[PDB]
């Protein structure tokens, strides 16, 4: 499965079948590192939801001390020392104020629910595209070339462990768009023409793996007069040794 997902990002499977121990150790070390990076320090995006909901309920409770234009904020003090005909006005003022408070709370809850629904739809798409498969979208399942994802349950949320491929230890090489050998322009099949200074090779884009330029590695199109940056080289045909 790891070899398949390596093929998904443009790196051949033999790299992994040759470095399996190194990749396994790197993955285990990365899991250990995220263990420590989580233990030491935060889940603020998830703590914010509970903090906001608790604060909304607390402020709804606290807004019961507002007079709303009445002589007192307690219905008991309104109902005692006032008879119904003139206490009804104060009770109506308080009712209107508290109704407005409830309506405001409901509106804020609806807006926050819409935002959370957008987040939940994004999480569902993220799960379906990174956990149930491999995504070719850039920067969708982490920074780099996506390999897989692991979902973890969190209070009021989901947490993804994105396994990504990040290249390192680059090197300088000389390049050319085409090689023409016998008056015919040869272009790489699934690689790029590179040179270590004296000899010319064709290698895959995301990993240095030089190979000799043969008739299987390249294909012919045109002559040596159309393309601009062509250079001269020999293209070894693996048939003369077989007939010699």
């Amino acid at each position: 499965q790891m070899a398949y997902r390596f093929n998904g990002i443009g790196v051949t499977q033999n790299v992994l079948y040759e470095n399996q121990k190194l990749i396994a150790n790197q993955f285990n070390s990365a899991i250990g590192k995220i263990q420590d990076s989580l233990s030491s320090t935060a889940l603020g995006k998830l703590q914010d939801v509970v903090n906001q909901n608790a604060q909304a309920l607390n402020t709804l409770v606290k807004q019961l001390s507002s007079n709303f234009g009445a002589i007192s904020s307690v219905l008991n003090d309104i109902l005692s020392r006032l008879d119904p005909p003139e206490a009804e006005v104060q009770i109506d003022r308080l009712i209107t104020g508290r109704l407005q408070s409830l309506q405001t709370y409901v509106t804020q809850q609806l807006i926050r629910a819409a935002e959370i629904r957008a987040s939940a739809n994004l999480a569902a798409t993220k799960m379906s595209e990174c956990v149930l498969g491999q995504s070719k979208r850039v920067d969708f399942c982490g920074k780099g070339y996506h390999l897989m994802s692991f979902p973890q349950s969190a209070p009021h949320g989901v947490v993804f462990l994105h396994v990504t491929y990040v290249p390192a230890q680059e090197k300088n090489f000389t390049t050319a768009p085409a090689i023409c050998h016998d008056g015919k322009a040869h272009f790489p099949r699934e690689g790029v023409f590179v040179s270590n200074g004296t000899h010319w090779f064709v290698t895959q884009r995301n990993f240095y793996e030089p190979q000799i330029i043969t008739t299987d590695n390249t294909f012919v199109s045109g002559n040596c007069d159309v393309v601009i940056g062509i250079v001269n080289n020999t293209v070894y045909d693996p048939l003369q040794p077989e007939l010699d």
């Binding site: 790891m2 396994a24 790197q26 993955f27 285990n28 990365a30 899991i31 995006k45 939801v49 909901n53 219905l75 119904p84 009804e88 009770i91 109506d92 308080l94 009712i95 109704l99 409830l102 309506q103 709370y105 409901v106 809850q109 609806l110 629910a113 959370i116 629904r117 987040s119 939940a120 739809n121 569902a124 799960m127 379906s128 982490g142 979902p151 969190a154 009021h156 949320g157 989901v158 947490v159 993804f160 462990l161 994105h162 990504t164 491929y165 990040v166 290249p167 390192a168 230890q169 680059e170 090197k171 300088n172 090489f173 390049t175 050319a176 790029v192 290698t203 995301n206 990993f207 240095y208």
Partner: protein, 220 residues
């Protein structure tokens, strides 16, 4: 400079506030402008570590309408910042002042600087040069996404009236409002369960990992 007609005494703007007034003794027109103007913000590094603050006056051009002048007066495009020392370095933003200026509690005093976008870099473009990696790193990163919020229900009778029977009787003229509020809250409550089911219930077969933990070296 306004010229009132002989029958006019006051002048009003679009907000109906009085703007021009004729002096009844000298017969000259005068304009009334409010005394309060300008925004004020306070920058604090936390009361558990220091008491020192800096105040940002967003409508003052210091080259005044200030509470106190002190020292270290620095002009920014977001206003006049007083109480902070200007530095020529560039760090990541800590407390956003505005207009590209941020503040921090460094060496103690409060300092203000222009935020740095990042390390300057240049890629050596050439006509016949390419860079191809020889190694790789497998990195694991965390992405946290909220999925749901707390489900709440509200009783108007208990919130507004409590145990007051007179108030409860007077509340019968607003029952449609409570029906609407409870309907909206119920919609939110069912939507949260739908969100959780949509995100986590993609597959309806509970696969289990077997006791043969031979994953080729990968430890889960």
């Amino acid at each position: 400079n306004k010229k009132f007609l002989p029958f006019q005494q006051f002048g009003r703007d679009i907000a109906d506030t009085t703007d021009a007034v004729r002096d009844p003794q000298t017969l000259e027109i005068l304009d009334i402008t409010p005394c309060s103007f300008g925004g004020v913000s306070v920058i604090t590094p936390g009361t558990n570590t220091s008491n020192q603050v800096a105040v940002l006056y967003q409508d003052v051009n210091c080259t005044w309408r200030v509470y106190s002048t002190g020292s270290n007066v620095f002009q920014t495009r977001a206003g006049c910042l007083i109480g902070a020392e200007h530095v020529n370095n560039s760090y990541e933003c800590d407390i956003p002042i505005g207009a590209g200026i941020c503040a921090s509690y460094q060496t103690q005093s409060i300092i203000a600087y222009t935020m740095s976008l990042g390390a300057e870099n240049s890629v050596a473009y050439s006509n016949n040069s390419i860079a191809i990696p020889t190694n790789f790193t497998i990195s694991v990163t965390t992405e946290i996404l909220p999925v749901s919020m707390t489900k709440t229900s509200v009783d108007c009778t208990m919130y507004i009236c409590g145990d007051s029977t007179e108030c409860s009787n007077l509340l019968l003229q607003y029952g449609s409002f409570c029906t609407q509020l409870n309907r909206a809250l119920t919609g939110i409550a069912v939507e949260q369960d739908k969100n959780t089911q949509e995100v986590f219930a993609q597959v309806k077969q509970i696969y289990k990992t077997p006791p043969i933990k031979d994953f080729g070296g990968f430890n889960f």
